[PDB]
DNA sequence: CCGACGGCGCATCAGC
DNA sequence: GCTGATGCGC
DNA sequence: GTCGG
């Protein structure tokens, strides 16, 4: 963690711009700079040494100069003191409360955790579940627990239909020792880019996972994305495991590699790769890679591997463990 | 200097 | 009810 | 906030 101070500071500036300012491009800009600094294999000794990185320009260079000299950033010392900025930042930590709803609660005087618990009737369903598990969701999942969650998920899916393949992606597939939550990619041969030969393909799996008391709450559910809550079984006289966020994404079976690339991330890796893809005249989503001609997407190029996606844009292959940008 | 910034699923809302 | 925009999430 | 054209 050679430049942890700097990247914490940038992440905190990024969170401010997203949550308070509602400036999503400064948020991405700060997070890109944070990202490029975190992989820099030297202890940064000045801002001008940092401005040499792509994504670090003049404003951030000055902030890194200030931070190296004093150990803090007055722009951030002030944000920390503004009670309104601090209240809005706190409320966005509840899942389903975003920058707009956070600023709306503050106008009403709902600014603290006790205020939300007294005003549950002002929360939609997602927000209510986010409040319900606010502290559990703050906790990280050790890989050992993700391994048990994987075993349960894969075994329960095989009981529904042995032709399902479920793949755990996200930071787990990149090899992190701990994860924010669980992300499961789901395929079945009945669902392709050409046909849906069976309805309820995601519902049945969700239903089955609810039946064994693994999934405990539904934040949102449609025909290809589930977002909810799960929890490992505990033993006799044992404290319960914290409840965990789980996302299941059903993806057409012939689009697996584009989906698994998407769902392995990281989010910033996906941003840099899809940005670079544009520069090479392609567009990438979780289904296909397509050429650009007028700037309009052409037809899906053939993809047989994650590597074929990298090839098209003239990137050497990067294993999942080296995509934690 | 300036346009452009990755791409999309689900929930909710306005307007018809 | 649908359609498109907005909010919030991955 | 940053950057390539
Ligand atoms: N904006 C995003 N764009 C993306 O393409 N994604 C893709 C890439 C991610 O890896 C994956 C899962 O999302 P998650 O939020 O779970 O990220 P993880 O990488 O798994 O990190 P932890 O769970 O905190 O360990 O979805 C996520 C975004 C979220 O902000
Ligand atoms: Ca995750
Ligand atoms: Ca997730
Ligand atoms: Cl597509
Ligand atoms: Na730079
Ligand atoms: Na939130």
GROMACS .gro file of C-alpha atoms (C1' of nucleotides) and ligand atoms in nm:
model
  391
    1UNK     CA    1   0.000   0.000   0.000
    2UNK     CA    2   0.275   0.239  -0.106
    3UNK     CA    3   0.048   0.541  -0.158
    4UNK     CA    4  -0.247   0.458   0.064
    5UNK     CA    5  -0.273   0.810   0.202
    6UNK     CA    6  -0.303   0.956  -0.148
    7UNK     CA    7  -0.552   0.701  -0.277
    8UNK     CA    8  -0.769   0.725   0.035
    9UNK     CA    9  -0.776   1.104  -0.013
   10UNK     CA   10  -0.875   1.072  -0.378
   11UNK     CA   11  -1.142   0.811  -0.305
   12UNK     CA   12  -1.282   1.044  -0.039
   13UNK     CA   13  -1.284   1.333  -0.287
   14UNK     CA   14  -1.452   1.102  -0.540
   15UNK     CA   15  -1.722   1.001  -0.293
   16UNK     CA   16  -1.785   1.370  -0.220
   17UNK     CA   17  -1.834   1.461  -0.587
   18UNK     CA   18  -2.070   1.169  -0.649
   19UNK     CA   19  -2.280   1.194  -0.333
   20UNK     CA   20  -2.286   1.569  -0.253
   21UNK     CA   21  -2.199   1.757  -0.571
   22UNK     CA   22  -2.370   1.500  -0.796
   23UNK     CA   23  -2.082   1.536  -1.044
   24UNK     CA   24  -2.043   1.180  -1.172
   25UNK     CA   25  -1.754   1.273  -1.400
   26UNK     CA   26  -1.539   1.416  -1.123
   27UNK     CA   27  -1.617   1.097  -0.930
   28UNK     CA   28  -1.494   0.881  -1.219
   29UNK     CA   29  -1.200   1.117  -1.271
   30UNK     CA   30  -1.092   1.093  -0.907
   31UNK     CA   31  -1.136   0.717  -0.908
   32UNK     CA   32  -0.933   0.676  -1.228
   33UNK     CA   33  -0.650   0.876  -1.073
   34UNK     CA   34  -0.678   0.682  -0.748
   35UNK     CA   35  -0.662   0.362  -0.951
   36UNK     CA   36  -0.357   0.455  -1.158
   37UNK     CA   37  -0.169   0.564  -0.845
   38UNK     CA   38  -0.250   0.242  -0.658
   39UNK     CA   39  -0.070   0.030  -0.916
   40UNK     CA   40   0.231   0.264  -0.932
   41UNK     CA   41   0.517   0.053  -0.786
   42UNK     CA   42   0.703   0.343  -0.618
   43UNK     CA   43   0.639   0.562  -0.313
   44UNK     CA   44   0.527   0.888  -0.476
   45UNK     CA   45   0.749   1.177  -0.365
   46UNK     CA   46   0.582   1.475  -0.538
   47UNK     CA   47   0.276   1.576  -0.735
   48UNK     CA   48   0.473   1.637  -1.054
   49UNK     CA   49   0.592   1.275  -1.035
   50UNK     CA   50   0.224   1.184  -1.007
   51UNK     CA   51   0.106   1.414  -1.289
   52UNK     CA   52   0.318   1.189  -1.514
   53UNK     CA   53   0.051   0.929  -1.476
   54UNK     CA   54  -0.251   0.931  -1.711
   55UNK     CA   55  -0.552   1.053  -1.519
   56UNK     CA   56  -0.345   1.269  -1.283
   57UNK     CA   57  -0.345   1.629  -1.407
   58UNK     CA   58  -0.293   1.974  -1.257
   59UNK     CA   59  -0.559   1.992  -0.984
   60UNK     CA   60  -0.481   1.648  -0.839
   61UNK     CA   61  -0.107   1.718  -0.863
   62UNK     CA   62  -0.151   2.023  -0.641
   63UNK     CA   63  -0.360   1.821  -0.396
   64UNK     CA   64  -0.091   1.554  -0.375
   65UNK     CA   65   0.167   1.827  -0.309
   66UNK     CA   66  -0.048   1.962  -0.025
   67UNK     CA   67  -0.104   1.612   0.114
   68UNK     CA   68   0.264   1.515   0.104
   69UNK     CA   69   0.373   1.834   0.284
   70UNK     CA   70   0.111   1.837   0.562
   71UNK     CA   71  -0.051   1.492   0.575
   72UNK     CA   72  -0.401   1.623   0.508
   73UNK     CA   73  -0.610   1.823   0.262
   74UNK     CA   74  -0.793   2.136   0.376
   75UNK     CA   75  -1.053   2.091   0.101
   76UNK     CA   76  -1.127   1.759   0.269
   77UNK     CA   77  -1.096   1.897   0.624
   78UNK     CA   78  -1.375   2.141   0.537
   79UNK     CA   79  -1.598   1.881   0.371
   80UNK     CA   80  -1.566   1.675   0.688
   81UNK     CA   81  -1.697   1.969   0.895
   82UNK     CA   82  -1.992   2.068   0.677
   83UNK     CA   83  -2.274   1.891   0.863
   84UNK     CA   84  -2.492   1.881   0.549
   85UNK     CA   85  -2.220   1.728   0.330
   86UNK     CA   86  -2.146   1.480   0.607
   87UNK     CA   87  -2.512   1.386   0.651
   88UNK     CA   88  -2.566   1.334   0.277
   89UNK     CA   89  -2.251   1.125   0.254
   90UNK     CA   90  -2.365   0.908   0.543
   91UNK     CA   91  -2.715   0.843   0.408
   92UNK     CA   92  -2.586   0.721   0.069
   93UNK     CA   93  -2.421   0.437   0.257
   94UNK     CA   94  -2.768   0.280   0.286
   95UNK     CA   95  -2.825   0.063  -0.021
   96UNK     CA   96  -3.093   0.218  -0.240
   97UNK     CA   97  -3.040   0.570  -0.105
   98UNK     CA   98  -2.846   0.758  -0.371
   99UNK     CA   99  -2.725   1.118  -0.396
  100UNK     CA  100  -3.075   1.249  -0.485
  101UNK     CA  101  -3.264   1.063  -0.212
  102UNK     CA  102  -2.990   1.148   0.038
  103UNK     CA  103  -3.025   1.521  -0.031
  104UNK     CA  104  -3.404   1.482  -0.014
  105UNK     CA  105  -3.398   1.323   0.333
  106UNK     CA  106  -3.170   1.600   0.463
  107UNK     CA  107  -3.422   1.864   0.355
  108UNK     CA  108  -3.676   1.684   0.576
  109UNK     CA  109  -3.447   1.655   0.878
  110UNK     CA  110  -3.376   1.282   0.835
  111UNK     CA  111  -2.999   1.300   0.874
  112UNK     CA  112  -2.894   1.015   1.106
  113UNK     CA  113  -2.939   0.641   1.149
  114UNK     CA  114  -3.195   0.681   1.428
  115UNK     CA  115  -3.391   0.915   1.200
  116UNK     CA  116  -3.419   0.647   0.934
  117UNK     CA  117  -3.531   0.382   1.182
  118UNK     CA  118  -3.807   0.615   1.304
  119UNK     CA  119  -3.912   0.696   0.946
  120UNK     CA  120  -3.917   0.350   0.789
  121UNK     CA  121  -4.249   0.441   0.625
  122UNK     CA  122  -4.071   0.701   0.410
  123UNK     CA  123  -3.841   0.436   0.255
  124UNK     CA  124  -3.915   0.229  -0.053
  125UNK     CA  125  -3.858  -0.145  -0.032
  126UNK     CA  126  -3.493  -0.152  -0.139
  127UNK     CA  127  -3.406   0.131   0.101
  128UNK     CA  128  -3.592  -0.041   0.384
  129UNK     CA  129  -3.388  -0.357   0.330
  130UNK     CA  130  -3.067  -0.153   0.304
  131UNK     CA  131  -3.143   0.008   0.640
  132UNK     CA  132  -3.238  -0.330   0.788
  133UNK     CA  133  -2.892  -0.472   0.712
  134UNK     CA  134  -2.691  -0.149   0.725
  135UNK     CA  135  -2.421  -0.285   0.950
  136UNK     CA  136  -2.409  -0.634   0.800
  137UNK     CA  137  -2.359  -0.486   0.455
  138UNK     CA  138  -2.066  -0.276   0.581
  139UNK     CA  139  -1.884  -0.601   0.656
  140UNK     CA  140  -1.658  -0.779   0.409
  141UNK     CA  141  -1.681  -1.149   0.332
  142UNK     CA  142  -1.369  -1.362   0.386
  143UNK     CA  143  -1.284  -1.587   0.094
  144UNK     CA  144  -1.344  -1.890   0.317
  145UNK     CA  145  -1.708  -1.783   0.355
  146UNK     CA  146  -1.736  -1.709  -0.018
  147UNK     CA  147  -1.624  -2.068  -0.077
  148UNK     CA  148  -1.912  -2.204   0.133
  149UNK     CA  149  -2.153  -1.966  -0.036
  150UNK     CA  150  -2.030  -2.094  -0.373
  151UNK     CA  151  -2.078  -2.456  -0.271
  152UNK     CA  152  -2.437  -2.388  -0.160
  153UNK     CA  153  -2.520  -2.187  -0.473
  154UNK     CA  154  -2.370  -2.433  -0.720
  155UNK     CA  155  -2.520  -2.741  -0.553
  156UNK     CA  156  -2.865  -2.582  -0.523
  157UNK     CA  157  -2.862  -2.476  -0.886
  158UNK     CA  158  -2.769  -2.828  -1.000
  159UNK     CA  159  -3.076  -2.958  -0.812
  160UNK     CA  160  -3.302  -2.733  -1.021
  161UNK     CA  161  -3.157  -2.841  -1.355
  162UNK     CA  162  -2.817  -2.999  -1.416
  163UNK     CA  163  -2.771  -2.792  -1.736
  164UNK     CA  164  -2.740  -2.465  -1.546
  165UNK     CA  165  -2.387  -2.339  -1.504
  166UNK     CA  166  -2.332  -2.087  -1.225
  167UNK     CA  167  -2.005  -1.898  -1.209
  168UNK     CA  168  -1.900  -1.677  -0.918
  169UNK     CA  169  -1.740  -1.360  -1.055
  170UNK     CA  170  -1.655  -1.020  -0.914
  171UNK     CA  171  -1.361  -0.988  -0.680
  172UNK     CA  172  -1.392  -1.358  -0.593
  173UNK     CA  173  -1.299  -1.466  -0.946
  174UNK     CA  174  -1.006  -1.218  -0.933
  175UNK     CA  175  -0.878  -1.399  -0.625
  176UNK     CA  176  -0.941  -1.144  -0.351
  177UNK     CA  177  -0.895  -1.277   0.002
  178UNK     CA  178  -1.219  -1.091   0.089
  179UNK     CA  179  -1.520  -0.964  -0.109
  180UNK     CA  180  -1.777  -0.690  -0.080
  181UNK     CA  181  -2.055  -0.929  -0.186
  182UNK     CA  182  -2.133  -1.233  -0.404
  183UNK     CA  183  -2.187  -1.211  -0.783
  184UNK     CA  184  -2.312  -1.519  -0.966
  185UNK     CA  185  -2.330  -1.551  -1.344
  186UNK     CA  186  -2.596  -1.798  -1.456
  187UNK     CA  187  -2.632  -1.978  -1.789
  188UNK     CA  188  -2.874  -2.239  -1.918
  189UNK     CA  189  -2.881  -2.386  -2.272
  190UNK     CA  190  -3.248  -2.286  -2.313
  191UNK     CA  191  -3.159  -1.914  -2.308
  192UNK     CA  192  -2.942  -1.785  -2.594
  193UNK     CA  193  -2.918  -1.470  -2.803
  194UNK     CA  194  -3.147  -1.646  -3.054
  195UNK     CA  195  -3.424  -1.786  -2.836
  196UNK     CA  196  -3.574  -1.815  -2.490
  197UNK     CA  197  -3.696  -2.175  -2.494
  198UNK     CA  198  -3.807  -2.171  -2.124
  199UNK     CA  199  -3.954  -1.898  -1.901
  200UNK     CA  200  -3.877  -1.849  -1.530
  201UNK     CA  201  -3.516  -1.963  -1.581
  202UNK     CA  202  -3.391  -1.716  -1.318
  203UNK     CA  203  -3.701  -1.736  -1.098
  204UNK     CA  204  -3.670  -2.112  -1.041
  205UNK     CA  205  -3.311  -2.070  -0.920
  206UNK     CA  206  -3.405  -1.780  -0.690
  207UNK     CA  207  -3.706  -1.975  -0.562
  208UNK     CA  208  -3.485  -2.278  -0.492
  209UNK     CA  209  -3.229  -2.063  -0.308
  210UNK     CA  210  -3.510  -1.908  -0.101
  211UNK     CA  211  -3.651  -2.253  -0.022
  212UNK     CA  212  -3.328  -2.359   0.153
  213UNK     CA  213  -3.321  -2.029   0.345
  214UNK     CA  214  -3.009  -1.910   0.165
  215UNK     CA  215  -3.167  -1.605  -0.002
  216UNK     CA  216  -3.356  -1.404   0.261
  217UNK     CA  217  -3.463  -1.080   0.090
  218UNK     CA  218  -3.528  -0.945  -0.261
  219UNK     CA  219  -3.410  -0.594  -0.345
  220UNK     CA  220  -3.501  -0.619  -0.712
  221UNK     CA  221  -3.588  -0.900  -0.950
  222UNK     CA  222  -3.645  -0.923  -1.326
  223UNK     CA  223  -3.604  -1.190  -1.594
  224UNK     CA  224  -3.221  -1.158  -1.609
  225UNK     CA  225  -3.098  -0.970  -1.298
  226UNK     CA  226  -3.163  -1.059  -0.935
  227UNK     CA  227  -3.036  -0.838  -0.653
  228UNK     CA  228  -3.096  -0.946  -0.294
  229UNK     CA  229  -2.969  -1.084   0.033
  230UNK     CA  230  -2.831  -1.422   0.148
  231UNK     CA  231  -2.678  -1.575   0.463
  232UNK     CA  232  -2.482  -1.891   0.546
  233UNK     CA  233  -2.637  -2.145   0.785
  234UNK     CA  234  -2.488  -2.138   1.132
  235UNK     CA  235  -2.447  -2.427   1.375
  236UNK     CA  236  -2.599  -2.495   1.718
  237UNK     CA  237  -2.525  -2.223   1.978
  238UNK     CA  238  -2.345  -2.023   1.708
  239UNK     CA  239  -2.379  -1.652   1.636
  240UNK     CA  240  -2.551  -1.605   1.300
  241UNK     CA  241  -2.341  -1.507   0.999
  242UNK     CA  242  -2.398  -1.149   0.882
  243UNK     CA  243  -2.643  -1.116   0.597
  244UNK     CA  244  -2.471  -1.066   0.259
  245UNK     CA  245  -2.552  -0.889  -0.066
  246UNK     CA  246  -2.593  -1.126  -0.360
  247UNK     CA  247  -2.643  -1.048  -0.731
  248UNK     CA  248  -2.740  -1.312  -0.987
  249UNK     CA  249  -2.715  -1.231  -1.357
  250UNK     CA  250  -2.863  -1.467  -1.617
  251UNK     CA  251  -2.671  -1.428  -1.943
  252UNK     CA  252  -2.734  -1.595  -2.281
  253UNK     CA  253  -2.524  -1.909  -2.293
  254UNK     CA  254  -2.358  -1.814  -2.624
  255UNK     CA  255  -2.258  -1.479  -2.472
  256UNK     CA  256  -2.081  -1.630  -2.166
  257UNK     CA  257  -1.733  -1.487  -2.229
  258UNK     CA  258  -1.859  -1.132  -2.274
  259UNK     CA  259  -2.072  -1.175  -1.962
  260UNK     CA  260  -1.798  -1.331  -1.752
  261UNK     CA  261  -1.560  -1.053  -1.861
  262UNK     CA  262  -1.816  -0.793  -1.761
  263UNK     CA  263  -1.895  -0.960  -1.428
  264UNK     CA  264  -1.533  -1.030  -1.330
  265UNK     CA  265  -1.454  -0.657  -1.348
  266UNK     CA  266  -1.329  -0.461  -1.176
  267UNK     CA  267  -1.559  -0.171  -1.252
  268UNK     CA  268  -1.259   0.049  -1.330
  269UNK     CA  269  -1.100  -0.225  -1.538
  270UNK     CA  270  -1.423  -0.252  -1.737
  271UNK     CA  271  -1.420   0.127  -1.781
  272UNK     CA  272  -1.062   0.138  -1.910
  273UNK     CA  273  -1.112  -0.164  -2.135
  274UNK     CA  274  -1.437  -0.037  -2.285
  275UNK     CA  275  -1.288   0.313  -2.322
  276UNK     CA  276  -0.982   0.169  -2.497
  277UNK     CA  277  -1.213  -0.047  -2.711
  278UNK     CA  278  -1.380   0.271  -2.836
  279UNK     CA  279  -1.038   0.417  -2.924
  280UNK     CA  280  -0.971   0.105  -3.131
  281UNK     CA  281  -1.311   0.143  -3.296
  282UNK     CA  282  -1.517  -0.116  -3.106
  283UNK     CA  283  -1.786  -0.121  -2.841
  284UNK     CA  284  -1.809  -0.386  -2.569
  285UNK     CA  285  -2.098  -0.470  -2.342
  286UNK     CA  286  -2.181  -0.784  -2.139
  287UNK     CA  287  -2.332  -0.952  -2.446
  288UNK     CA  288  -2.109  -0.874  -2.744
  289UNK     CA  289  -1.814  -0.686  -2.883
  290UNK     CA  290  -1.919  -0.488  -3.188
  291UNK     CA  291  -1.733  -0.273  -3.442
  292UNK     CA  292  -1.812   0.093  -3.493
  293UNK     CA  293  -1.853   0.214  -3.852
  294UNK     CA  294  -2.114   0.713  -3.837
  295UNK     CA  295  -2.044   0.582  -3.487
  296UNK     CA  296  -2.313   0.312  -3.505
  297UNK     CA  297  -2.252  -0.037  -3.369
  298UNK     CA  298  -2.203  -0.304  -3.630
  299UNK     CA  299  -2.284  -0.670  -3.581
  300UNK     CA  300  -2.144  -0.898  -3.308
  301UNK     CA  301  -1.796  -1.028  -3.381
  302UNK     CA  302  -1.731  -1.396  -3.306
  303UNK     CA  303  -1.603  -1.465  -2.955
  304UNK     CA  304  -1.483  -1.807  -2.831
  305UNK     CA  305  -1.284  -1.699  -2.525
  306UNK     CA  306  -1.219  -1.406  -2.298
  307UNK     CA  307  -0.890  -1.372  -2.481
  308UNK     CA  308  -1.058  -1.317  -2.820
  309UNK     CA  309  -1.217  -1.005  -2.669
  310UNK     CA  310  -0.874  -0.880  -2.563
  311UNK     CA  311  -0.727  -0.962  -2.907
  312UNK     CA  312  -0.974  -0.749  -3.106
  313UNK     CA  313  -0.865  -0.439  -2.916
  314UNK     CA  314  -0.496  -0.537  -2.927
  315UNK     CA  315  -0.456  -0.590  -2.552
  316UNK     CA  316  -0.245  -0.879  -2.429
  317UNK     CA  317  -0.449  -1.114  -2.210
  318UNK     CA  318  -0.475  -1.023  -1.843
  319UNK     CA  319  -0.575  -1.293  -1.598
  320UNK     CA  320  -0.864  -1.207  -1.363
  321UNK     CA  321  -0.622  -1.159  -1.071
  322UNK     CA  322  -0.451  -0.878  -1.268
  323UNK     CA  323  -0.772  -0.685  -1.338
  324UNK     CA  324  -0.822  -0.549  -0.984
  325UNK     CA  325  -0.790  -0.188  -1.095
  326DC     C1'  326  -0.942   2.504  -2.597
  327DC     C1'  327  -1.344   2.125  -2.607
  328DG     C1'  328  -1.613   1.723  -2.650
  329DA     C1'  329  -1.649   1.299  -2.431
  330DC     C1'  330  -1.616   1.036  -2.046
  331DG     C1'  331  -1.864   0.229  -2.042
  332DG     C1'  332  -2.264   0.007  -2.084
  333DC     C1'  333  -2.698  -0.168  -1.907
  334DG     C1'  334  -3.104  -0.401  -1.561
  335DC     C1'  335  -3.471  -0.295  -1.243
  336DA     C1'  336  -3.785   0.047  -0.990
  337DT     C1'  337  -4.032   0.449  -1.006
  338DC     C1'  338  -4.244   0.856  -1.208
  339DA     C1'  339  -4.444   1.197  -1.536
  340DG     C1'  340  -4.719   1.251  -1.902
  341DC     C1'  341  -5.038   1.086  -2.228
  342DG     C1'  342  -5.169   0.063  -1.958
  343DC     C1'  343  -4.734   0.219  -2.241
  344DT     C1'  344  -4.307   0.512  -2.326
  345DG     C1'  345  -3.919   0.772  -2.202
  346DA     C1'  346  -3.655   0.995  -1.844
  347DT     C1'  347  -3.448   0.962  -1.396
  348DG     C1'  348  -3.256   0.715  -0.978
  349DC     C1'  349  -2.979   0.354  -0.818
  350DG     C1'  350  -2.753  -0.038  -0.868
  351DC     C1'  351  -2.383  -0.391  -1.090
  352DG     C1'  352  -1.097   1.657  -1.324
  353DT     C1'  353  -0.848   1.504  -1.726
  354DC     C1'  354  -0.726   1.441  -2.197
  355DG     C1'  355  -0.675   1.365  -2.720
  356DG     C1'  356  -0.764   1.570  -3.138
  357LIG     N1  357  -2.004   0.043  -1.215
  357LIG     C1  358  -1.982  -0.089  -1.227
  357LIG     N2  359  -1.948  -0.139  -1.348
  357LIG     C2  360  -1.923  -0.272  -1.370
  357LIG     O1  361  -1.893  -0.315  -1.479
  357LIG     N3  362  -1.934  -0.361  -1.259
  357LIG     C3  363  -1.903  -0.502  -1.279
  357LIG     C4  364  -1.753  -0.530  -1.239
  357LIG     C5  365  -1.762  -0.578  -1.094
  357LIG     O2  366  -1.657  -0.668  -1.064
  357LIG     C6  367  -1.889  -0.655  -1.102
  357LIG     C7  368  -1.949  -0.679  -0.963
  357LIG     O3  369  -1.979  -0.561  -0.896
  357LIG     P1  370  -1.924  -0.529  -0.747
  357LIG     O4  371  -1.994  -0.397  -0.711
  357LIG     O5  372  -1.970  -0.648  -0.665
  357LIG     O6  373  -1.774  -0.518  -0.762
  357LIG     P2  374  -1.648  -0.621  -0.703
  357LIG     O7  375  -1.541  -0.611  -0.811
  357LIG     O8  376  -1.709  -0.761  -0.704
  357LIG     O9  377  -1.588  -0.573  -0.562
  357LIG     P3  378  -1.633  -0.618  -0.417
  357LIG    O10  379  -1.765  -0.694  -0.433
  357LIG    O11  380  -1.652  -0.490  -0.335
  357LIG    O12  381  -1.522  -0.703  -0.361
  357LIG    O13  382  -1.977  -0.578  -1.185
  357LIG     C8  383  -1.966  -0.309  -1.136
  357LIG     C9  384  -1.992  -0.177  -1.113
  357LIG    C10  385  -2.027  -0.125  -0.981
  357LIG    O14  386  -2.006  -0.012  -0.942
  358LIG    CA1  387  -1.888  -0.835  -0.563
  359LIG    CA1  388  -2.219  -0.711  -0.641
  360LIG    CL1  389  -2.557  -0.630  -2.757
  361LIG    NA1  390  -0.110   1.287  -1.650
  362LIG    NA1  391  -2.666   0.408  -0.159
   0.00000   0.00000   0.00000
